[PDB]
Design a protein around this ligand. Structure first.
Ligand code: AGS
Ligand code: MG
Ligand code: ZN
Lengths: 48, 670, 166, 91
């Protein structure tokens, strides 16, 4: 009457080099655009 | 800072530097002072750079394998951690060691400006074989935390699979454009290309693997019967599977005792062939790194039985040694010891120091160990110099201890008991393999003991049907099997050493010798030597035996006798290099002795009459005696000693020719 | 091992080799063989009868002048005895050698007679040494004494000869 | 002492399979630091577990460091650290 086996992961090695067409790198670039964009002197999207 | 392989404590650069310093700076005097052996240190062997000279001779002979004693790593100060890293993490450390060996190979020829070409060295792949990695712990005492660790196992080889092709590069060809690629395997997985790689052709599912174009490696599975030093309570012997790869395939034959060092591996097994579901309980096995077939305590294998195997070993370049190497100083010692006038008594006395007296029995055992010369006819006939000995005796005569000693001293013999063995279990049988669920042929005790001595205790108690197997073994040194699975002729070149009791369990002087032995004449004629070992009670003999038995218990660990290592190597050298021949003076003496004992047999069963097999036994024993003294010819005194040993073994001087009875008092001297 | 004679009941008419259906080689393996004779007597049977009736009535042992050692206590004492490793000296070795010589000569004398219990062998000597070492282990001593050897010898003698003589 | 305690013995007796994991959680919550340092004679499992613990610490530190490098509010230090560890251990 046992429960589920569970699957989980943890980052260990660097892996292959990142690719621009990879979804994770596109998400990271979008995140950097949200955080670091400056219109005149303000973080407009972060504050928004 | 320091770069460490994940899951290890191993730094590649640190390990390379430590191992290179070990290779450049190790001396065997470090091993001597590690083992607390200071008085045995000599300059000419220890002071020279050990691994440098092995690398030099390895370059000179063109070999690629280096044998590394891991105890030497513990001897050196800087590589004490490297020893534990090699034991704990052999997969990375062994590869690091191979790279360091290749670096030292190129550095030795660049530094000394030798004429050896660098391109030929660079193309070669060098690999190191560690051994003596620790104590031979029990295989069943290992835990799952010992997986992927280096271990030592002593064992007996029962059988091996045929050579298995293990795919390393896969060859794909396009069906439409005949475009071919080769993909190298990665951790047991080959990725099929879903589409053709060429820019012109892009058909999906068009690459087909060609099984005969692609390359394979040799893989062999060997069933090993472990013989650990320590056995816990109520433990039965087990068989493990060991996997050998590449050059080590077919190095081990069935029935030989080996030291295996290798990594302790576990894999999941598929529950079904069609399903990819694996079983949670893992199957354990050993991936073999190094095999040792040489022990200093016991003799080496008879090379006349493995001449073609030695040729195939040279072809395969496995660089595994079946025989121990004889150096010049110890060969000089062998030649000096052979010049002793008391050589026969010294060699027989050094057989079983724990066993007191039994001088003629020990002499016969020594001659059985030496053996007669082996003659192979160019036409196709074959004569083997195998001596069979029967020891019929009273209880408490140490003949079981003699059989135990011979079983320990022989390279590949088998020890069996009366009524503990069957006719099928002695020759060959068919078993169902656990891994493959297939019927496989497996050798019996006599075939496993080929090239050695088969010891049979309680030979009197064996069944007659089980006895009758031994006829062909004793006379032709082979078994001709015609069964459902196998119909063939199998070599069983095993000298038979049997121990037996009389009918009444004690020798009866009222009955003749033949009745006391109680063997059929066809079986008893095939024995070269028959020893009647008798218990005569005397003051001095009983006093001496009692003192000898009580000196053992004076201390916890107990004339001049040769050490067992020197004894084994001396007998090994004599068997390998001495093949004595009969001369005319030996021929006339052999003929006169055979005619004389046939004339003695004319008198009126009660007595064992002379038969032609006794003439063959005289020839074999004379050849063995000549081989003992390193002489290449059998002259008259060897034949006289063989005749004397035959007479004294049955105590023919003590018995009366007419009655056949033996009287204890009137002649016998204990 | 536990056994009965060949006829099922021991008879003094036959030799003790004759009514014991045991080969000499298997006889020599046993370090101690106890002949256990059921000889009726008026005094010895009464003590057995009162012992057995007391056991059947109070479900325990008769003699209240000693307390039996518990099996667990006996087990740990025997374990501590088995940890010991006694060795023999020169004097006990000489005494053992002389005893073995006397045993061999005595057996040779008894061989023709009906009093024979077999022939003394080196296994008899090794059994004497083994019993002496066991008796030294019980005293938790690292050496074997004269008295332990004499106790082993008297155990061997009252095993077979003493009860058959009576 | 007079304080009220649950019957832990009976609860373990009825449902021991759960209490194995509960005791393991309690033990892992209060585990003393090793006085000894790891050398080359330790087990492979021990150095694997040590590397896993060091990896967990390094990921936690890297996550909180880059989140602090964001400064996504430019704004109560202790409450900020509590919310910081809360978001880092969740990501
Ligand atoms: N001649 C001897 N030299 C040294 N030890 C002996 C000698 N004879 C007997 N012993 C000792 O006595 C023990 C008796 O065992 P064994 O003599 O080997 O038995 P056995 O000779 O095979 O006779 P069996 O078993 O009845 S056929 C040996 O283990 C030795 O310790
Ligand atoms: Mg025996
Ligand atoms: Zn194509």
């Amino acid at each position: 009457s046992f429960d589920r086996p569970e699957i989980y992961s943890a980052p260990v090695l660097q892996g292959e080099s990142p690719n621009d067409d990879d979804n994770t790198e596109i998400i990271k670039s979008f995140k950097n655009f949200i955080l670091e964009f400056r219109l005149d002197s303000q973080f407009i999207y972060r504050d928004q | 800072p320091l770069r460490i392989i994940w899951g290890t404590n191993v730094s590649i650069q640190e390990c390379t530097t430590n191992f290179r310093n070990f290779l450049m700076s190790f001396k065997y005097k470090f091993r001597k002072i590690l083992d607390e052996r200071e008085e045995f240190i000599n300059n000419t062997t220890d002071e020279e750079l050990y691994y440098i000279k092995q690398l030099n001779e390895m370059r000179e002979l063109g070999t690629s394998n280096l044998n590394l004693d891991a105890r030497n790593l513990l001897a050196y100060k800087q590589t004490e951690d490297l020893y534990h890293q090699l034991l704990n993490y052999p997969q990375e450390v062994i590869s690091i060691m191979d790279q360091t060996i290749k670096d030292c190979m190129v550095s030795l020829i660049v530094d000394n400006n030798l004429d050896y070409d660098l391109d030929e060295i660079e193309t070669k792949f060098y690999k190191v074989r560690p051994y003596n990695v620790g104590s031979c712990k029990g295989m069943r005492e290992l835990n799952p935390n010992d997986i992927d660790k280096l271990i030592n196992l002593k064992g007996l080889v029962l059988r091996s699979t045929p050579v298995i092709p293990d795919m390393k590069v896969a060859f794909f060809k396009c069906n439409v454009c005949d475009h071919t690629m080769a993909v190298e395997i990665d951790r047991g997985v080959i990725q099929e290309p879903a589409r053709c790689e060429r820019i012109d052709c892009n058909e999906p599912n068009s690459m087909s693997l060609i099984h005969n174009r692609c390359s394979f490696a040799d893989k062999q599975v060997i069933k090993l019967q472990e013989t650990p030093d320590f056995v816990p309570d109520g433990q039965t012997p087990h068989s493990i599977s060991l996997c050998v790869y590449d050059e080590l395939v077919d190095s081990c034959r069935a029935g030989d005792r080996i030291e295996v060092t290798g990594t302790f591996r576990s894999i999941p097994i598929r529950a079904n062939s069609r399903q990819r579901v694996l079983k949670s309980l893992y199957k354990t096995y050993v991936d073999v790194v190094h095999v040792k077939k040489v022990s200093d305590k016991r003799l080496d294998v008879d090379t006349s039985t493995i001449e073609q195997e030695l040729m195939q070993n040279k072809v395969d370049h496995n660089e595994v040694e079946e025989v121990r190497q004889i150096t010049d100083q110890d060969l000089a010692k062998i030649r000096e010891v052979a010049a002793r006038e008391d050589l026969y008594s010294l060699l027989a006395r050094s057989i079983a120091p724990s066993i007191y007296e039994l001088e003629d029995v020990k002499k016969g055992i020594l001659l059985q160990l030496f053996g007669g010369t082996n003659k192979t006819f160019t036409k196709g006939g074959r004569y083997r110099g195998d001596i069979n000995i029967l020891l019929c005796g009273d209880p408490s005569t140490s003949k079981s201890q003699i059989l135990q000693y011979v079983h320990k001293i022989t390279p590949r013999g088998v020890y069996t008991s009366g009524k503990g063995s069957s006719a099928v279990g002695l020759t060959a049988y068919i078993t169902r393999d656990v891994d493959t669920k297939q019927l496989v042929l497996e050798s019996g005790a006599l075939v496993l003991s080929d090239g050695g001595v088969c010891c049979i205790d309680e030979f009197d108690k064996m069944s007659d049907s089980t006895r009758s197997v031994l006829h062909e073994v004793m006379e032709q040194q082979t078994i001709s099997i015609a069964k459902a699975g196998i119909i063939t002729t199998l070599n069983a070149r095993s000298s038979i050493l049997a121990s037996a009791n009389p009918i009444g369990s004690r020798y009866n002087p009222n009955l003749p010798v033949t009745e006391n032995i109680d063997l059929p004449p066809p079986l008893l004629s095939r024995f070269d030597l028959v020893y009647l070992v008798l218990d005569k009670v005397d003051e001095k003999n009983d006093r001496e035996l009692a003192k000898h038995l009580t000196n053992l218990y004076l201390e916890d660990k107990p004339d001049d006798v040769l050490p067992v290592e020197f004894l084994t190597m001396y007998i090994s050298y004599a068997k390998e290099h001495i093949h004595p021949i009969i001369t005319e003076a030996a021929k006339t003496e052999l003929v006169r002795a055979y005619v004389g004992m046939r004339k003695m047999g004319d008198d009126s069963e009660k007595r064992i009459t002379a038969t032609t097999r006794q003439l063959e036994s005289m020839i074999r024993l004379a050849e063995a005696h000549a081989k003992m003294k390193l002489k290449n010819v059998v002259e008259l005194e060897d034949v006289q000693e063989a005749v004397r040993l035959i007479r004294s073994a049955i105590k023919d001087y003590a018995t009366d020719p007419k009655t056949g009875k033996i009287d204890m008092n009137l002649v016998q001297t204990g | 091992a536990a056994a009965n004679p060949l006829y099922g009941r021991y008879n003094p008419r036959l030799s003790p080799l004759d009514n014991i259906n045991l080969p000499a080689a298997l006889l020599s393996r046993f370090d101690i063989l106890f002949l256990m004779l059921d000889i009726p007597s008026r005094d010895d049977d009464e003590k057995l009868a009162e012992h057995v009736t007391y056991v059947h009535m109070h479900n325990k042992q008769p003699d209240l002048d000693f307390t039996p050692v518990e099996p667990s206590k006996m087990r740990e004492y025997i374990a501590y005895a088995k940890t010991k490793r006694p060795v023999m000296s020169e004097a006990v070795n000489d005494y053992v050698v002389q005893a073995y010589i006397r045993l061999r000569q005595d057996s040779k004398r008894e061989m023709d007679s009906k009093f024979s219990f077999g022939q003394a062998t080196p296994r008899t000597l090794l059994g004497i040494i083994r019993l002496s070492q066991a008796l030294a282990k019980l005293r938790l001593a690292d050496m074997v004494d004269i008295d332990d050897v004499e106790e082993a010898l008297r155990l061997v003698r009252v095993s077979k000869e003493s009860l058959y003589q009576e | 002492q007079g304080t009220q305690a649950d019957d832990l013995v009976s609860a373990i007796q009825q449902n021991a399979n759960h209490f194995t994991e509960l005791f393991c959680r309690a033990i892992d919550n209060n585990m003393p630091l090793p006085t000894k340092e790891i050398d080359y004679k330790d087990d492979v499992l021990d150095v694997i577990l040590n590397q896993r613990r060091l990896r967990n610490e390094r990921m936690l530190s890297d996550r909180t460091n880059e989140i602090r490098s964001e400064n996504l509010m430019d704004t109560p230090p202790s409450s900020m650290n509590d919310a910081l560890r809360e978001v880092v251990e969740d990501e």
